[PDB]
């Protein structure tokens, strides 16, 4: 079974806001795990997310992805580590019940229905390769087979097909993020994809515009590895697709290594570094649809990497400029994109920056869960300061801009310049053509652009400020402030491109 081309077209417009449920908004102070991995209140729940949908929608996002919300049943006598694990949802017991520390089944149904009203898709987190030891049998009487971690395929396939279809039929969720997807063999992903596509076409709901639609059936694999492994374990071969979308970890690293440093300190790369990462998409088969995120619940926050690398701090202007540069790269990236909660306000963990190794789990400070900080949602859990609001407004402008210009979400990309100081892409989709330019240097600069090299015949219009740029002797001259990005509409493209 090939990938569905209608879904691929729809997937390019996904602007996904990721929510780690336990550490997000404590909306019902009567329920919650109260322990976990991270420094948050550990009492996030479905009411908190429900209270946050309007905020999320005004960001410009059109989807939410929740970490697993299914029932992780406590085993009598289990140690404190097993209580913390239960709060993550990643080692569950009952795939067919909502964990009562997060809420009820009725509240889940209310969450999805309300998100659908406000114009948001909903994705759940499917862990189909491992589970807690006390896993509970399915409604149709199935159980997964083999070890708890990993389970055996194909014996466990009937069980996980039942999981994947249950929440689509019951709540009409729009798809699945697929945890540690290399644990499930590619053969089985095709079969689970068939069930999801079938389950999704067998139910409908009314979207925010009155239209009755099927749930999307989106599926995106999490494979924390490089391009050859994402290809081998996730996308599959040319002509023989396994999954159709995986997270773009390689380009995520290029971004933070250009505009900050990664968890290991590799940093201060330039525009050439971004461009080489995008060119490595050639290693994927033609059906592959990578999904670019900047961070997630397993990665240190951008803001803390800036501080870790001694690059910038929230008091300094470069800290905010560098956030905007990275977020602008994402907004220009063709394909689905995902934003981890708090990136839109440059969140960081006060008093933390350097890596903490010894005894880090109990302090909530290991690199793989330190981003699970309590959600600062403006108007709900926090009043933002002027710099946080300025960044959130900018993320809104990017997402609104992206929703309006096909060249950003599904454009063909052609690189114009990639050097130590600037990165300039040409994006074209139908007759929407624009130039994306971002500075990768702390110095101000002027960019010379030959009108013929970018297939431009008329003017360039800054899509955010409105400034017209006119060519003189066949050249545009644009000034770039340090780490400043501009989206320039090619107002009258040439005969071809
Ligand atoms: O004490 C051991 C270990 O516990 C914690 O690790 C857990 C993660 O916090 C938890 O989320 C889950 O990890 C999953 C990832 O989040 C998920 O994105 C996927 O890609 O991989 C994991 C499989 O679900 O489970 C791990 C433990 O297995 C804590 O964060 C660690 O520091 C600690 O070492
Ligand atoms: Ca709560
Ligand atoms: Ca910090």
Author numbering: 0 to 496
Q: What text comes from the article?
A:
It was created on the basis of the isolation and phylogenetic analysis of a novel α-amylase, designated AmyP, from a marine metagenomic library. AmyP exhibits high substrate specificity for starch over pullulan or cyclomaltodextrins, efficiently hydrolyzing starch into glucose, maltose and maltotriose. AmyP is a raw-starch-degrading enzyme (RSDE), thus making it of potential interest in the food processing and green-fuels communities. The AmyPΔSBD is composed of A, B, and C domains and shares structural features with other GH13 α-amylases.
Substitution of the glutamic acid at position 221 of AmyP with glutamine (E221Q mutation) resulted in nearly complete inactivation of the enzyme. The E221Q mutant displayed 0.125% of the activity of the wild-type (WT) enzyme in thses assays. The crystal structure of the E221Q catalytic domain mutant AmyPΔSBD in complex with maltotriose was obtained through co-crystallization of the E221Q mutant of full-length AmyP with γ-cyclodextrin (γ-CD) (AmyP-E221Q/γ-CD). Peptide sequencing of protein bands from the dissolved crystal sample by sodium dodecyl sulfate polyacrylamide gel electrophoresis (SDS-PAGE) and liquid chromatography-mass spectrometry (LC-MS) showed that partial degradation of the SBD domain of the AmyP-E221Q/γ-CD crystals had occurred. The structure of AmyP-E221Q/γ-CD contains electron density representing a maltotriose molecule bound to the active site and occupying subsites -1, -2 and -3, whereas the structure of AmyP/β-CD contains electron density representing a maltose molecule at subsites -2 and -3. These observations suggested that the E221Q mutant possesses activity for γ-CD and the WT enzyme possesses activity for β-CD at the high concentration in the crystallization drop, thus producing maltotriose from γ-CD and maltose from β-CD, respectively. Stick superposition of the active site of AmyPΔSBD-E221Q complexed with maltotriose on the structures of GTA and TASKA indicated the remainder of the strictly conserved residues for subsites −1 and −2, including residues participating in hydrogen bonding and aromatic stacking interactions. In this work, the resulting glucan in the crystal structures, however, was not the cyclodextrin, but a degradation product, G2 in the case of the WT enzyme and G3 in the case of the active-site mutant.
